[model samples]
Target: MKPLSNMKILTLGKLSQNKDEAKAMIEKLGGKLTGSANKASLCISTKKEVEKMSKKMEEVKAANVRVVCEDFLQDVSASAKSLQELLSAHSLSSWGAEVKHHHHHH
Candidate 1:
């Protein structure tokens, strides 16, 4: 929840479908690019990718880096506020839905 400029973001799997473009978007939104997921403060990735990470990717998990679905990055891209604030706002909007909800993955 640090300032966007202070967050280390890494995109992976299908979320990296447009690698350069996504990286550019992250930078444009004030997050820094990190090749190592373990070092990332927030990892922007597909849900499947995040699921597959539960155990196979212990380094990142051990780091406690937040794994958010692609929409999180997109939301941040569209909002001009801090990631912390965006997350809180999104949490409220996504509240009370079943876990299967589109915005529930975060």
Candidate 2:
């Protein structure tokens, strides 16, 4: 894996239900919400000054809110591959899988 640097993308999931708590966490980690819909798609950019955001996310998880780590195309590519195989085999389809397959060409 590449050392996460300024140009990477970090995504958080299952954010705390409290908006203030979520905002504080984001700010403390040197992150800013770039865009979001339904408040669930919290996307943060790993700018050079924000290299420690990932570690802070782990701390947030320890505090009880479920958090997830997501990289740019890395996350999407793996999900796509997994979804393609699952769909080809007639396994249960998920929203993630469906979106993956919809844009997958190979």
The best candidate in terms of lDDT = 1
lDDT at residue 35 of model 2 (Cα atoms): 40
Please give, for residues 20-68, the per-residue lDDT of candidate 2 as tens digits: 6655544443444544222322233233323454575444333322222
lDDT of 1 by residue, 12-76 (tens): 55764377877666677688878766577666655566556555345555655656666676665
TM-score between candidate 2 and the true structure: 0.24
The residue pairs that clash in candidate 2, if any, are none
Taken over the whole model, the C-alpha lDDT of each candidate is 0.59, 0.35
Off by over 4 Å in 2: 1-14, 36-106
By TM-score, the best candidate is: 1
